[PDB]
Amino acid sequence: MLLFCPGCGNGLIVEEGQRCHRFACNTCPYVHNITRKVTNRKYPKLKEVDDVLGGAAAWENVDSTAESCPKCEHPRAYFMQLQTRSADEPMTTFYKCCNAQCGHRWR
Amino acid sequence: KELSVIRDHAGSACLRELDKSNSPLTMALCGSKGSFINISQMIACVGQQAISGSRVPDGFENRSLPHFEKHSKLPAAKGFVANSFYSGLTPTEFFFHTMAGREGLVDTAVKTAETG
Amino acid sequence: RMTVGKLIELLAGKAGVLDGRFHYGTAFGGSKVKDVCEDLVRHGYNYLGK
Amino acid sequence: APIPTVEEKWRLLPAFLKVKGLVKQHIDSFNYFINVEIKKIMKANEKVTSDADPMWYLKYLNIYVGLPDVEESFNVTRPVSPHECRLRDMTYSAPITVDIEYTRGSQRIIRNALPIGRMPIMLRSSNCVLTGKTPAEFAKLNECPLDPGGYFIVKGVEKVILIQEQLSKNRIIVEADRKGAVGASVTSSTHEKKSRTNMAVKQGRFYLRHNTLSEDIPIVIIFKAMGVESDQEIVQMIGTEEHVMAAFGPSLEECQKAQIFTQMQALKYIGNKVRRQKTKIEEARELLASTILTHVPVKEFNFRAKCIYTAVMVRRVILAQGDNKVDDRDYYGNKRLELAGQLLSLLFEDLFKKFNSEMKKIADQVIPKQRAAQFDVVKHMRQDQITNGMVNAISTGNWSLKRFKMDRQGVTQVLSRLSYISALGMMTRISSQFEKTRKVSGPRSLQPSQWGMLCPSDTPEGEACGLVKNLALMTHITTDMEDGPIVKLASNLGVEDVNLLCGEELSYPNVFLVFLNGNILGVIRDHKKLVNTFRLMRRAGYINEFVSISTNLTDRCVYISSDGGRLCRPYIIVKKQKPAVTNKHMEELAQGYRNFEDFLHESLVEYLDVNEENDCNIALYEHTINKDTTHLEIEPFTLLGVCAGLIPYPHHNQSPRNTYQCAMGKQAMGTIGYNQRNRIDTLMYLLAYPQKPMVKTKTIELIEFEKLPAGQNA
Amino acid sequence: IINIKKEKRETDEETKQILRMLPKDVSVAELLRELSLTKEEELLFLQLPDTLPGQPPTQDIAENACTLADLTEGQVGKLLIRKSGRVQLLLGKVTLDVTMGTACSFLQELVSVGLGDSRTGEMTVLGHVKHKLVCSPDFESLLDHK
Amino acid sequence: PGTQMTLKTFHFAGVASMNITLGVPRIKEIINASKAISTPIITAQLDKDDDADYARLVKGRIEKTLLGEISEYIEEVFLPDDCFILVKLSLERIRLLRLEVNAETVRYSICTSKLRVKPGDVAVHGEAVVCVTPRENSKSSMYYVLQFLKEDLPKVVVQGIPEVSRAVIHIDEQSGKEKYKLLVEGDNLRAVMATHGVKGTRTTSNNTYEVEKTLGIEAARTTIINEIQYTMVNHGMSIDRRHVMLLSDLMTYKGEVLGITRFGLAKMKESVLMLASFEKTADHLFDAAY
Amino acid sequence: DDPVVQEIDVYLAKSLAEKLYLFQYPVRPASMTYDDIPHLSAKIKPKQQKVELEMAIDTLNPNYCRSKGEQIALNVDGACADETSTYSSKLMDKQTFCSSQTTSNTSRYAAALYRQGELHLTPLHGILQLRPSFSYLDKADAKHREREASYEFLQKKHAEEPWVHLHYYGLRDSRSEHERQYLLCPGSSGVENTELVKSPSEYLMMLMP
DNA sequence: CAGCGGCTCTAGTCTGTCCAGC
DNA sequence: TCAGACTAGAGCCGCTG
RNA sequence: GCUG
C-alpha cells in the first residue's frame, strides 16, 4: 500500500533498522518503526466458472423447425439467412438439418 | 428465438392462403427466381436485421439511436422490423434495414481485393 | 429484389392520369393504396390495375 | 385519448431552406472567409521589417476583396459575368486591394488601394454579380436561376471544393494499440502548431511519447519537471481508489530508481533526451511550455493547468484496462467538416507569408547596397504570387502547404453536368479521410450517429462505398463562435477554478469536470442545474444557438463545444408532453407574420447536435410522445437526401435498390438549365421531349426538379 | 513512534492506516449545525459572482464590474433559508442562489499579512477554514421576469 | 468459391461459443501455411467419456489456472525482524475444482522463471499457506521488488498447460448415445496428447504446423485435406477431393509444409524467370547474375 | 416555501480587505495542523505575492532517524564552514515551504466569519498554495557536482522586489484572538443599503453584455 | 571462474493488397 | 493501412570447460 | 472521379 511521509510527502519504502523494520523516506530523516503486525490484503478473483457447453438445446434455440431441406427433407432443422453481399441481388441462406443426424450444410 | 419464431409463424400463414396462380408463389416453387423467405419478407414480416451476425450495436452511448431509452434491449430498439415491405418501413425500421443492407456492400468490396 | 414501390408507382400514376392528379410518393407517407384503388374503379378500370 | 397533431409542421422545412441548406453551407463559408478571416490573416501579419537597416517599415491597415473584373489588352477593364468566363476560358476573379503605410524617408507615406492579387469569387456569394438578381436579369447574364452556385470558375472549368471530413482536434482519444495494450492520444492542433502526444503502458508503467523526444519517458518525471514534486500530489490527481493506485504503483517505483527527486533533475533528464533541431534545462522547459500538449495554455511557466490535464489522460487509460471502453473514431460527434472557406484560409495565409518574405528579401538586397534613394516597395509588389497560388491550387486540386505539413490531393472536382441532379448532388458530397487506403469495413458501415445528418442510401457502389457520403436535406454546419460569453456565463454558474484545489476532488463522485473545446474550465457539483441553465440561456438568445452542451456520466465530464464544423439539425422543443410549436404558429409562418429565426428566439425550435442528441429523447411523431421526451422531429422524410428524394415510395423497397437509383439518377439524360443552348461544354446530353414525374416526392417540389425534368412516362 | 506524525494514507479523509486499537452535507444543514447544535464561530469561505448588482459609489467609473472592494461597510443583504433546503442570498432587489462548493479536506489557514514597516511586519493566523459556499445568479428567475 | 463466400456469420463450431475464422480468411490461413493462426483449436476425445465427473478432472489438467485464481488472499507482511509476501490457498475451492495442487506443489510452480527465487526462500508452513521471502534483484532494481511480486505472483501457473487459454466440454445430441468431447483453444498439441485421460490416438488440430511438428508430414498432409474440405462444405461449396488432394501433395512433397507464398514458391520452383514474374522481381534477377 | 428558519443578516467589513490571505496546504490533511510546530521565519514579497516559511522539526522524538539526518545535512553543507549554512546544527533542523499563486484576481472571493444569527464578509487579497520545498536536495547535488567537477528574463524581473520579513504569531497567541475581531464591522442591526439598488433586468444585462 | 553458444527476444524492415475500361 | 515472416542485433543463464 |  502507498504510505507517504508527513514531512515532505514522498513515497515511503520499507527497510530494516537496528531494532525494527522501518518505513523510511528517501529524502528526509523520517522513519516509522513497525512495532506491531500490519497487513494489506489484495483479495483477487477466483476462476469460479465450470461451464459445460454444446448441448442440443443450446443448438436448437433458433426459430426454424419442420421445414424442407433439398437433401434429406427432415423436420428438425437449424436455419440461417444472410444478405450482406449486395453483389448478390438474390438472397442468401444456409441450413442445418439434424433429425436423422445427417448434417447437411448448403446454400 | 421468440422474435424469429413469430416471423416463421407469420410466414407459414401467408403461404397457406396465397392462391395458386399467385405469380410470386410460382417462381418460388419452380425455383426460377426468389424463395419462400422473400415472399414472407415482403408480405408478412421482415426479419431481425443483423450486422455481423448480431443485433444492432450501440452507435451512441448505451443505445442504438436517440429515439430509444438507454440500456433498453427491446426488439424494436435493436433492429427488429415488425413491418413488411408492403406496409412500408418506419423511419426507425428503415434505418435498421439499410444498415444491415450496407453490410452487404462492405463485405463484397473487401472480398474482391483479397480473393484476387 | 422486392421493389414493391415500383408496383405502387404504376398504380398511383394510373389513378392519377385518369383524373388529372399528381399522386405523392413521399417517404414514410404518400398516397395510400386504399385511396388509389377507389379512383380506378370509379373510372371503370380494375382496382388492382390488371 | 390520442395526442393531437399539428399538420402544418412540415412548413418549417421550406422556411428553413430559404436561409440554411440548398448549397448555403458552401456560400456561408466563403462569405466568412472574405469578410472576416482575410482581415485576421492580415492582422496577424500587419508589419514587415528588413533585418538590415532598421527604422524603415511597411504596415498593412486594411484589406478589400472587391468585385469581378477582367483585365484586357490596352488596360481597359470592365465587369464580367460568370458565363463570359465559361466561354472565353478565363478565371472569374476579383482584385484584392490593400492599403499600406510605409516609409520613403518621410516616415508616413500612404497608399489607399494597392492591388496585390486576385481572388476567385465563388458563384452566388456576396461579391458575385448574380446575388440578389431577379430571374428576368439572370437572362441578361445567361445564367439559370436554379443553378446552385457554390463553385468556382478557374480557367473556364467549373470546380467544386468538396466537404472534407476530419477528426476533432484537442480531444482525448482512448484506444487500443496493435499489440492489445490501451493508450491515449490528443492531436493538439493550434493555429501555431499541430502535434500528437501519446500515453503508453508498454511494461505496465506509464510513458509519454512525442516526436521531439528520442525515447519515451516516464510520466512521473514529467510531473516532477512541471513542478509537482511530491509523489502524493501526483497520486492525488491520478486517483485515490485502491485499484487506481495499484495500477499506478509500478510507475512511482521507476522514478525512485533514478535520482529524479527535484524539478531541476527532471528537466535535466528531459534535456538529455531531446532531439536537437542553454542546453539541458531550457530545451526541456520550453518544450513542455510550448510543444507537448500545446493546446493547453501555460501563462508564465505555471504548469498547474497542464498537470491536471495530463492527470485526466492517465486516469482514463487506467480505467480503460479494467473494462475495455475504447472509443470509436466512427461516432460523428467526434467528426468535423471542413468547407471551402476554411481550406482557402490556410492557402491564403501561406501565400501572404511567402509574399511578405519575398518582399523582405527584396528590401534586404537593395537597402544596404544599391542607392541613396529610399526605395519604395510599391515598385516590387508583383501580383503573380497571390493570383497563381490561388488558381493553381483550385485547378489542380493539390494543397501542398509546407507551413502546416499538409499535402492533400484530390480536393477539387469538376462539377458534373450530366443532369440537374448531378450538379446539385455533387454540392452536398462529403469526402472521407481514409480515401480508400484498404478494405477496412469499419467506417464504410452506416453508423447510427448519421441519423438526420447524412443520407443513409446515397453512397457510391464500388470501391468508394461508404467513403463518399451526402448531406441530408435539413442539416447545418456551424462556424467558429466568438467564445467570449460562454466563459463569463460558466464562471457564474458555480464552476470553481481548478487551481484552488488539490488533485483529490477529481476522484470524488459528486465532482464533474467542465471542458470547453478540450480546455478544462474547472469543476462543478450539481451538473444538472448547470446543463439546464445553460440551455435556457441559449434559448433566450444570450448564448449563441449553435453552442452545444452535453454530459458524459461514465467519465464525469460536461462538454461545451463552440467550434465550427459540427453537424446541427433543427428539432421542435417539447415540454411536459406538449410540443412548443402550435398550429397558430405554423399559420403565422405561412402568413409571413413569423419566420424560422422567430421560432428559435421564442424557444419553439432549437438546433441539436450529435453530442447533444445523445442526451435528448426524440419523438418521431406526436403519438409517440411519452413522459420523458425532450424534442419532436420536424419532418422525418428529411432523413433522406437530394438524390434519394427522387424515389417514389422508397420505404417499400429493399435498401440496395435505393442506392442504385442514387447512382443511376445522376446519369439520366435531361435538361441542364435554361442557359443550356448558350452553353458550350465538353459533352452535354439532352432529352428532346422531357416530361415531369407522374408520381413525385415533396423533395421534388423543394428542389424544383419538375421545372427541368429528366425522363418520360412509359 | 510519534502518534501525531503517522504516514499519510492517500485518501486525505482516511489518513489513519495504523491505529491505537462520508455522506455529503447541504447548505441548509451546514447553517443549522452552526446555529443550534454549536454556538462556536466558524470561518466560511464563499465565491460570489463576478459582478454584484451595484454601482461603484463616486469611484469615477462605463458600467464597469462591481465587487465587494467597491462597496461600503454595513448591512449588504439578507440570507434566507427556505423550506425544502433552498437557500437564497437576497443582496438587493435580486436574490442569488447559494450552494455548497467542492468539499476540501486539505488544510486551509486564514492569515493576516501586514507590512507595518518598510522591511518588517506581522503575520497572524486567524483560523482554519473548513467549508466553501458558492453564490450564483438565478438565471431562470432573472430571465423569466424579463 | 472464394468470390462466393460472402464472409457469413452464424458459425461457432457447434458450441454456442469458440468463434472461428471461416470463408476467405480461413482458406488464406491454410494455404499460407503460417506457423500461428487466429483461434487454433485442438479437439480432444476422452476415453472414459461416460459422465461429466471424469471430463472436469482432465479439463483441469490442461486448462490453465493461475495462483491468484485459487488463493483467497495474498498479503504483504512487514514485521520488525523480517518482511515477506504470503499466499493463502483456498483449499475449499481446490477440493471442488478437482485440481491436484496443494501448498507443497505451489512451491514447485514458483522457483521457475520468477526473478531467480531461491528454493530456500519459499516455505510451506501449513497445507494452506506459502511465504515468499523477497531478495534483492541486484540488476536494475531496488530491494522494494515486493511491489513487482505483488502484481506478478498471482499470474504464475500452478497447474495445466501454459499455452491453453481455455477448454470447453461439448455434448452430442444423437438419441443413440451421449458422450463428452473436450475442445481445447490453444496451441500445444503434444502436451494435450500426453495428459492422463485424453485418448491421444484420436485428438486432432486445426494447425498444420503443430500437426507436422508432432505427427509428421503425412498427418499434416491429411489435415490440409480435412480443413479445406471442412471450410468449403460449411459455405455450401463442393469440390471433388482430387483437387484438394493435389494441393496438399504439392505443399508436402519436399518433406516440409511449404506455403503458396513467395517464400514457399522460391523453395519449390527453380526457374528465375518464373520467380521474377511473380514478386520481388528485382532481387531474383540480381541473384541469378551473381 | 416561506423563509421559516434563519433569516440571517449579512454584513460587509473592509478593515482587513487589503491584508487577508488564504493559505492552503494541498498535501497536509485537515487533522494534522501546524498549530504546535514552532515557526522560525516568514518572508513575503507584497506584490507578486510569494510567501516562504521555515518550520522547525525536532530531533528528540522517535520519528527522526538521526543517522540519516546527519548524512543529508553533510551533503547540503560543507563539513565545518558555517558562515552561510541552511542548517546551523549538524542535523537537518528545518523544513522550508514555497508558495505557488493560484489566481491573478481574487475580487470575487470572501471569507465569512459566521456568528449566531449573522454573517460577516471580508474580501481576500490573495489565495496561495503552500508546498514543501525539495530545493535542499538540489543544493546537496550541486555541492556534489562542483566537487565531482523567456524564463531567464522573467525570473530577473521577480528578483527586483525586496524580501519583507514578518514575525509569526500562531493561532494560540493572543494577537490571533485580538485581530480576529477586525473581521467584524461596527454597524446597526437594520440598515437599508444605498448601493445594490439595480433591478433584475438591469443586472442580467450587466453580467451578459 | 570464465567463455561459447544457442536461445530468445525485440523490433526492423521491406513487401504485398482483382480484373479492366473510359 | 495491415500484417508479416524474414534479418540482424541485444541479452541470458548455465553448463562446459 | 466514375463505369464496367
Ligand SMILES: [Zn+2]
Ligand atoms: Zn519524507
Ligand SMILES: [Zn+2]
Ligand atoms: Zn440436410
